[PDB]
Symmetry: D2
Subunit: 453 residues, 4 copies
Amino acid sequence: HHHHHHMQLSSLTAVSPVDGRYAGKTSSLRPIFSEYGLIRFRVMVEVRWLQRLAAHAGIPEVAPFSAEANALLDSLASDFQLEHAERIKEIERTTNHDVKAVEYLLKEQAAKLPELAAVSEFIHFACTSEDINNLSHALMLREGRDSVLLPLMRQIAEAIRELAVKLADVPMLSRTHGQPASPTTLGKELANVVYRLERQIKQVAGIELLGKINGAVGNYNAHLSAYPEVDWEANARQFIEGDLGLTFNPYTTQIEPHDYIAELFDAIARFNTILIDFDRDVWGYISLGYFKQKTVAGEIGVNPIDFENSEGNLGIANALFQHLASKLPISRWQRDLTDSTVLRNLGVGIAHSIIAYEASLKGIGKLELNAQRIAEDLDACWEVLAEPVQTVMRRYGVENPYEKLKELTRGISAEALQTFIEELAIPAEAKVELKKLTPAGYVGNAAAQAKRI
Amino acid sequence: HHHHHHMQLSSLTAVSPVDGRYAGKTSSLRPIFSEYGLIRFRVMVEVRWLQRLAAHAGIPEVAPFSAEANALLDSLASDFQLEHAERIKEIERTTNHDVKAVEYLLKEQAAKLPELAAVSEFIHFACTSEDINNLSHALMLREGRDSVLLPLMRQIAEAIRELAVKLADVPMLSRTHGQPASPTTLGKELANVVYRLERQIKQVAGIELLGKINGAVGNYNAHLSAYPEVDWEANARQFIEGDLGLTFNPYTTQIEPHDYIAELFDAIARFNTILIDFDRDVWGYISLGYFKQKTVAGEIGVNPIDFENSEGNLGIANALFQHLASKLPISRWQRDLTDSTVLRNLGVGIAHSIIAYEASLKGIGKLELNAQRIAEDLDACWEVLAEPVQTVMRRYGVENPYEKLKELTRGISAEALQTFIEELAIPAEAKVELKKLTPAGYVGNAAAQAKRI
Amino acid sequence: HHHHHHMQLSSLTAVSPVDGRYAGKTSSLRPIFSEYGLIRFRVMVEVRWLQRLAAHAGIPEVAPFSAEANALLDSLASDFQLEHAERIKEIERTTNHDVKAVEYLLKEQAAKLPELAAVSEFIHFACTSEDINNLSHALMLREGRDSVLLPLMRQIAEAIRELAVKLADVPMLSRTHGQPASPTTLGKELANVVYRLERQIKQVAGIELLGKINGAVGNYNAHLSAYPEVDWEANARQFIEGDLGLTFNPYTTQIEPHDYIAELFDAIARFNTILIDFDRDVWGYISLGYFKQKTVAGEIGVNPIDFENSEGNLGIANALFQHLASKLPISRWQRDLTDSTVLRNLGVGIAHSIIAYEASLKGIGKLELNAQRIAEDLDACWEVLAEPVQTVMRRYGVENPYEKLKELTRGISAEALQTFIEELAIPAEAKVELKKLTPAGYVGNAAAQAKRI
Amino acid sequence: HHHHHHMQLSSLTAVSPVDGRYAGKTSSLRPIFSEYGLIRFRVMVEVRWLQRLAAHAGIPEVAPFSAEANALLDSLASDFQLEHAERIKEIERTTNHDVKAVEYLLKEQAAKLPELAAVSEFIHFACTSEDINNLSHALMLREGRDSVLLPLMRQIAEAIRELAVKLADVPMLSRTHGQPASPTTLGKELANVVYRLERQIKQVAGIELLGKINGAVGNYNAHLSAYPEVDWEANARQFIEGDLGLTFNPYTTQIEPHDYIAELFDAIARFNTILIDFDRDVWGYISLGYFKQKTVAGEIGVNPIDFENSEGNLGIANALFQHLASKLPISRWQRDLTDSTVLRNLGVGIAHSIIAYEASLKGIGKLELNAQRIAEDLDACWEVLAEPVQTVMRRYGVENPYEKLKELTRGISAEALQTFIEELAIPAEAKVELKKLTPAGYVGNAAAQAKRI
Ligand SMILES: Nc1ncnc2c1ncn2[C@@H]1O[C@H](COP(=O)(O)O)[C@@H](O)[C@H]1O
Ligand SMILES: Nc1ncnc2c1ncn2[C@@H]1O[C@H](COP(=O)(O)O)[C@@H](O)[C@H]1O
Ligand SMILES: Nc1ncnc2c1ncn2[C@@H]1O[C@H](COP(=O)(O)O)[C@@H](O)[C@H]1O
Ligand SMILES: Nc1ncnc2c1ncn2[C@@H]1O[C@H](COP(=O)(O)O)[C@@H](O)[C@H]1O
């Protein structure tokens, strides 16, 4: 027992490293995925709902707002104040109901202007709490994806592309099963990663972010009891697609079913898996000495600690993404509430991802070629030239090729190759090209593929 | 120690229930995902490669084949014989190399016709083993997806759609947190599942199945050493997209990187997750007595054992899909061989999925309505009508609504509602509609949504 | 784009709900698992190492400390000041090395007293950073397990035991496959959970928490170069087992290999899995109306939201525990650094666990029996008495039992049973006991088992 | 569409590679975990139950059996015939109930001897199907663990121990973060793995395998209705602990709750995780050329394909173990049947494990030292000797050590070290030892630790 007094929350004392050691890397998510962010977006959705009712000619009891009333509401929806989130937390100490606390805050703000007080009972009109929550979650995911996550993903792809093109012509021994194999270029091996990452970026950006607004159980019961002549399905689709810029989900229960969150998180996890592969392969190239790493003055160790930090955080991110994708879309009957607490972690997998992306970018920026080590391994591996000799022998039908090639590989050297080539019953132009071969020259079209990535 | 003599393999003695208790449900996968299937497709790809070289004007050493030579090759590629797979296994006892054994089998078959013997050294010309493997895996996945998996997925969606439409008008108490909530219809709750499943079917069917053919390390080194003037990238894309009907992957190492396998398995897993949710919710409806189940003469128990079997097998399927998606796309440098053994399990997650799909279809086919139990719970829940009364009161600005509504809910009954409605300062047409309300009538537009699924 | 200004960290703006919405439930972990906690324990281990060297007669250059020198060091190790952790973070901005920053802080504190300044180069003597880290992690896990986690686990077991005993005699219909089955008592069904939880508590408490202190790569190289005559293995075991109260790991690389962290987290996850099962089953009993829940004045809904919050957080906890157990014990060669960032999340799975445990305790405290609903289902299920009638018929060899029992079940009622029993060729004492049977009486020895849990 | 005719089951056509490509490695599991094995053990448990009743003085209606009756029953329980499992499958085509089919088979065998026919209604007396299933599962797991899995685990530990001792004195450069670090010995790095594996072997062997026998819902209801004076709890514990050699679980529902299966599978997974780490590290040593691999005559490639196969199969095994541990112990109320189909896969994770263990043993047996490559890297790394020089300088208080040591490392060589050591204000005996240092000599006590593993 090493007991300790209570400590106030700071980045030093935060239990999770998302808000702790890595707070500086995750702070852009605080307006989005925190409880403040959830409250902010709940208030936005409530305000826009009330404004939609005011504009709706089928809802005469909410008349179109004056500029002054709109200005108050627009300030809540687009210039949200921390003091209101603090008040909502205070109200929640009584209600033990977080969306009801948002409602009460909005009624308190509406009370201050008579035009808004007169329609205060239309705040949240016919809504269930999940009508507000699901639209908040989609807006949070849209903001986190588009303004924080995707820019960093594209930064990684472009930083690796720059190196792929720079290093396109640098021949390098390949390793399969860890053992020497036909050469490539270092730029080609980096280009391969760019191509994979960009496929997943396109998939991440393409996921439709679904929303609904349809009352307690999905069927607009309360809406139709009060306003049987209003087309509430048309209103909902216009609100969600037009007013909010999301994609409409026409069939739900109390909750939006969360399949699109699984789709999005599965796509981010696939990007992260490619980046784990990259972090490990580059750790391996640095272990071989093929890359060296720039140092920063005053720092104390060069070890690839940024790639290692990235790899560790991508694993955590993907574990969380896998859990949320597997668990969120199962909900008992017209819903159970186990998803609410889980959805408070939408930002946590994204946080571990962007921590890793910043770390991978830092590691990439330190990479410098060590051409001497790359060339050392290549020039010590004339054995890679058995394959092209064998393939040319096959083209031209050289007799007893297995025995014949074994005369060379019992082994290969520049001089032994020159001698062996002249023994072969192949045309003169075939000999000219084989005699030019060196390990570093036997790269196929790696460089051309790399340059056009 | 209960020791036992050695047992030959049969469905009774198979260790895995895929080939054991459930062999009858998985037998359509035997020509596809088994070692026989892998061998079958390897032979197909080798044959089509040789035929592509024969047709290629840039490869004059392989002349276009006679009809008789094509007939032999076409028989290997489209009427494959188990005896050849058995011979390949025999050869492999020497080579300890499965694709090399395919090569040797093809050379043995080519030896039988002089036209083919003359080009036997062009079997597998310039290929690495993974050129054959990755195209085999894509063709296997295409066949399993299109001819076995997707038809069963669509059968489930259509069987649930039929019930959704049949039961569209059947009012039912909703349960949120397990507790009574505003009514729906049983058909609407089934329609919700159809909509989710069909989104994932579209995603499953839409995954592009990627292939490559580019030699040892991705760069066509051997091809270009023998045939420097042939456009091998164009040839590869035409082979893969045109001859084989797959999608070209232009950047790979020795292996195709397997991201599209993660994409496909992530999409099947999302379908399976919806079907787990359905299996559990229907188990719950059967527990409530809302559905009864038909019985089969002579069987001994009615318990929802087909839904339970389905739910158990979907969990196994998804565990395997998650592992393969997470692990396959990480491979050391220009590849490690840990993916080979894992890819022998491509069919196993699919097998557990189709076992579950058959079980869910069997359970669905047994479902029959128990309207008495559904109505019993609804008519015992007049409390659901507080919400519409409250919403109408809000529309018309009824004073002190919290206190006023509490006069009714201290509770609600047909008679107490009639009396309470007449107390309200609301228009006559609002009273007419509230006075018609019954729990079973308070379903919103559930039925119309359900009918158009 | 709903852009937002930068926000300082508070529980409202924290991205993770561990330090956000649930900060009040996790604050006891801040002195333990946060970066502050890691720093605190690193300083403790360094101080105790230096004190061990001072006491070691084989290290004459560090003489036993004066009381005044011990007092300074003891204050660092047992009354740690946030200002020192803040200074360490400042130093780390230069070093980019967190344990080196601890070293420099300790050298700054040692400079203030000449007796300590004279041995400042023995701070961290012969250590590698992981000698300090691994002992810190074990001490952190010990404190979190023993002082925070295990007390809450035992609170749950005892709270369920109290209800099991209270409800031991309350007969209840069982449900298997969701369908009626032979009765039990509600207390017996709760007792079953206590027994399972306490097995896992014993396993959690029993995990040995392993430590090492052996230099850069596990072999005491530096120690032996300077002090070849000191038994450094004996010193390490005495330090770890005696001075620190941990268990010695005699074989490591640079890192302690983390298997015991997998053992501990696997055991906590098994407890959590039982508690998920409990949270779901109780949600089901509340859905059946068998339990009602107390309400709190002023709160706004009764729904089992505490059990649902618990269930959601146990799933997150277990996802993190599974990842850390699977990934931490794999480390490249004599180590890679991917474990460091992952180990900053040791407290996060524990945090989600204790959030869930508090929520489950809150839900349990609200539970009250609804005996009317339990009895309603039982008295409507005379069909459960076919089984005992059939078993008695088997004991006494009643002829044609299948046909005979079918005469009764075509069904069972109190009166039909009285009549049927008199038809049976069984002894008088067998009839006496069958005639007493009622559904609520047919509970076996459930009550006696429940009372002794 | 490459359609194909139906294929009968063989190892070539099996969908799962457990019964397919790897059938030869898994065939020892066929009498244990297959449907045959499940049936075999169900028959064993039923027979032993009937024999327990015959011996029970409180069950006078089943008299102690003649030797002839025991011989028939003992043959069913200890010399089980495939023909009976085939008959059970035939009966199951009618019953659609697998344990009821076992009952009917046993009644058919009992009919053949009048002494057994007279007690045929005591076959399965008062049991529920899960009384037979759970005891079967525990006996299956015991047999698979003790007779197949643990022997292979110990074979791996001993094979690595043999190499650890053989290579105990072989100095080797360490790599941390992939970069050079203080030397070790190759035998020490292998010894570290032995120690970890054997901890998990002890845990695997120590798991108690739990059983119950207590009727439909855990409360002996039917037993007590027929035999109210028999102590059925004492009988159950004696049957399970004494007759069957298992451990008693006193609190269950219809099912044994499966926590001990999670405990066992978690322990096997921890062993497998260590073996993945080993497979990867050895793949790395082979990539460095530190080990070479023996070849087999006629085989065609040396690549570490056995370690790669092992690593791939351990990942699959652990994915299945994780799923079964997480899912099996959650069961709705007094049970749902989703566990039945999942438990048919108890042998599948074990199968992938023993495939991997055989592959790792094959790879280990091929390992041979390449002392030239190990020594090449060591003798090229005099930089490892900065650490001991620095530590000796600290012991003796050498002034301005940072600047002083930098005079040497701007670098280190045998000659520069000799010169630098003579500059230091340290005692003569300290210089004698520093002057002896070479990279290969700077291994600490690695060799002594390795030799006593
Ligand atoms: N049906 C519901 N829909 C939305 N929110 C709800 C519902 N029922 C309760 N809540 C509130 O949702 C919040 C859940 O908190 P948590 O479990 O911490 O995510 C609490 O404020 C609950 O009172
Ligand atoms: N680089 C390679 N590409 C493709 N197959 C290979 C390679 N190296 C070895 N193999 C063969 O792939 C098979 C792998 O078997 P398995 O590990 O059981 O999936 C064996 O027949 C190996 O000899
Ligand atoms: N071999 C090592 N052992 C322990 N810590 C190290 C090692 N190398 C670097 N570090 C430091 O460990 C910390 C890792 O930070 P993080 O990746 O955020 O957990 C940084 O301060 C690194 O400089
Ligand atoms: N309550 C029960 N306990 C044990 N087995 C059962 C139960 N109810 C049904 N079964 C049988 O268990 C088997 C389950 O098959 P599967 O789902 O393929 O594992 C079928 O033969 C069912 O009829």
